[PDB]
């Protein structure tokens, strides 16, 4: 079993954990106590460790510079599921600064963190890779997640590392220093991860609100959508799928150059509870929905930008003759460079959710990511050039040239993604 180790870093990555792990528990027929619930299905071993007893243990580590995200997750939301010896807690938190997560505070926990990671690594014969789930907003997520990633890559250089980077909103999750942490941490993700998924919370809020225009939803829906997208990305790593069979294949399919690894996603039906009653989603509509504006979890229109890679992973019966006509029917909405064939790959895997006829998710390497980076970079520059809030970072060791370096690296990254636009 090619086993994956999942690490949740920061208050949001931890907030997500109970939704992510409950989906996996139900998907594979395991209860929330780790007990088997009937017949186990899928390659359970890839995400769960088998205990000396009948219990399955999520193969995961929770990291928080304060005590609170972990305390709520392991004591109130999903009791007895997470192993307490795999939880790392600090006391001070991060004061919302990148500087604490990466230079002044979070560094004292690296021996503890790498020790716990090795203990988890030592339990597996065939380790495929790591998934690091983190916010790029707050200092713990923005700071430690790259600190952890670098420590792992220097010890286990042959593994594939994937990050799930969550970009906070400009409204419900906003912060007055968001642009500093976002640029300072993109600068490190650029050299740290092999694959980096970008999920934009503002897209989630407007997409769910659109789907919910007819009803009252639930406040839990925003977290369920964010958690589900990770579960679906990973579906092919858990079931014997004819696609993204392994993290190494995701890397070879989607990332042509070491720096161009930032990926976008699209998902349909977003959540089962959003699409209820008569939901006979025919193979034809599902593929049109996946390139629709209201299914893309980014401020990206596929028609406005250029594709470098595009993989569509469906679940349930999806006849191949339909998938091919749907792709041909994309026309010029899905366009690549003249140095590439229109390398759009699609197929389907096993469905576990008894309420849905079919579903799917896509992974896109598209130039539109550059627009998010430029948005955040412009905000960074307005603040930086007039020293807003820089004293708080300088006080913890961020010599000013550190900010200048991040500024230049991101502008170069934006420039490179837009090369095919010109």
């Amino acid at each position: 079993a090619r086993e994956v180790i999942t690490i949740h870093v920061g208050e949001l990555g931890i907030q997500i954990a109970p939704n992510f792990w409950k989906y996996l528990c139900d998907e594979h027929n395991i209860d929330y106590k780790g007990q088997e619930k009937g017949k186990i299905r899928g390659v359970i071993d890839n995400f769960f460790e088998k205990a000396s007893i009948g219990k399955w243990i999520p193969r995961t580590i929770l990291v928080d510079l304060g005590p609170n995200a972990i305390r709520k997750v392991t004591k109130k939301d999903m009791k007895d599921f997470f192993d307490p010896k795999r939880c790392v807690m600090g006391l001070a938190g991060d004061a919302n600064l990148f500087a604490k997560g990466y230079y002044s505070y979070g560094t004292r926990f690296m021996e503890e963190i790498m020790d716990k990671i090795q203990k988890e690594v030592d339990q597996t014969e065939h380790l495929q890779g790591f998934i690091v789930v983190h916010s790029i907003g707050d200092g713990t997520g923005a700071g430690l997640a790259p600190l952890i990633m670098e420590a792992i890559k220097k010890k286990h250089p042959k593994l594939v590392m994937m990050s799930y980077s969550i970009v906070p909103s400009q409204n419900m999750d906003c912060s007055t220093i968001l642009p500093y942490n976002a640029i300072l941490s993109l600068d490190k993700l650029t050299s740290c991860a092999d694959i980096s998924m970008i999920i934009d919370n503002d897209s989630i809020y407007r997409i769910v609100a659109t789907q919910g225009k007819e009803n009252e939803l639930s406040e839990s829906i925003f977290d369920q959508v964010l958690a589900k997208a990770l579960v679906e990305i990973t579906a092919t790593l858990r079931f014997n799928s004819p696609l993204n069979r392994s993290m190494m294949e995701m890397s070879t399919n989607l990332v042509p150059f070491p720096r161009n690894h930032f990926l976008m996603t699209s998902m349909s039906p977003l959540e089962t509870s959003l699409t209820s009653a008569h939901q006979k989603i025919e193979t034809k509509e599902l593929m049109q929905d996946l390139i629709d504006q209201d299914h893309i979890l980014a401020p990206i229109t596929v028609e406005k930008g250029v594709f470098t890679a595009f993989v569509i992973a469906l679940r349930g019966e999806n006849p191949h003759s339909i998938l091919q006509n749907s792709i041909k029917g994309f026309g010029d909405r899905v366009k690549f460079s003249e140095i590439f064939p229109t390398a759009i790959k699609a197929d389907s895997t096993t469905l576990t959710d008894e309420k849905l006829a079919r579903s799917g998710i896509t992974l896109m390497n598209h130039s539109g990511v550059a627009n998010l980076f430029q948005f955040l970079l412009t905000q960074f520059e307005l603040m930086y050039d007039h020293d807003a809030f820089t004293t708080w970072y300088y006080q913890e060791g961020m010599q000013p040239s550190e900010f200048e370096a991040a500024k230049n690296n991101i502008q170069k990254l934006i420039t490179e993604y837009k090369q095919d636009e010109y």
Binding site: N68, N96, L97, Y205, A388
Partner: protein, 427 residues
Amino acid sequence: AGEIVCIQVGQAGNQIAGAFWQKICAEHGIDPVNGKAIDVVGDTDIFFNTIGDKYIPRAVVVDLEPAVVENIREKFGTLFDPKSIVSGADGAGNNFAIGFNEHGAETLEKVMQVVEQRVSETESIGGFILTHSCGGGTGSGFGSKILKTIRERYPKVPIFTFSIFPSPKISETVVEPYNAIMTLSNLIKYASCSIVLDNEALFSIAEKKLEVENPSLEDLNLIIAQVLTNVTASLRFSGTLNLDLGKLVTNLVPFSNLHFLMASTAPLVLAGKESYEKMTAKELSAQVFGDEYICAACKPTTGRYLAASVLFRGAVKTSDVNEAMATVKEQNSFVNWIPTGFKISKSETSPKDSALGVIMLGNNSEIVSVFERIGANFDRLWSRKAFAHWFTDSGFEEKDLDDARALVQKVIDDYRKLTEDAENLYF
């Protein structure tokens, strides 16, 4: 971890903090006059030291007054631990110089020993909160020496001060502007954040938003206490995502000397089901950002914001927060360089007298008008040297009175220059 030590200095400081502690004890489920509880909720460890079944509020109670302990037993029962109460010998007669210079070395050493014990019963220090009044003789001068002393012993720890400034129209004593400037000079140098409150604003609120007829200071303190309990909700009720004092300093203070904040809350409800279930986040945001709930003599809708934060309590819908805040961004005025404007947070636990509630804090350039009025009153008295002998015969030099004024003017000039420059930072 984010444990809080409160310091209460002087009569106003003790009465305001008193109202706070008794409201905190209602939300957590503790007896306000005994400290005894069986079943409590929330993270009580942030503010209380629990021994057996008694929850002891972590506070240092300070006065210069000869019988401060008895004066507390009579109103607060046994809620406060007498070992934390520091009594004085004579008192400061509304004279900053007595609270600041001629207080007695022993008085200050005892206060510091009490503070050290309170910080010694913590796994970590989350911050200090100082409650006081700028026109007094102990809450001004002694409270100021305490900020100096605390910041020297514990640098890099967020100190929040809540203080009463002179009222805009009528004044209390003639000496009040001298006490107010020197207090402000020390707030400028030592606090991480300061919340500016005054009684004129609070009285208008008490008479128009509360149902109470002919309110006294006892009622007025429930508005201040409501600001204090709401600003600490996320700390007390945890949550996966939350706000500590260090989150507020990082997000609201763009420069080290522009930390003076305005505060506003709604709804204001006196104990009992006297409220109405408006249940609308949109209405509460519209109210908290209006001028009618501002707890200081200023008019924020006519100024410009450097930053602001909003904490929503109770079962507030995400969708309403986003729409409500969109309205706020469209109606108000912000400075371009800070491009995101706000810090937004939610805590699902309701205040005891309302299902929903909102607290807002922020940096509004309008605040200089409070400081400018104080400055001008001082300048006229200072030029004529009226009541001045009371400060120079108590250890100050004219130089100290002049330097304190100069520091205050520097802050005013920095807020105003930034605000005027801002009009063209958009072109």
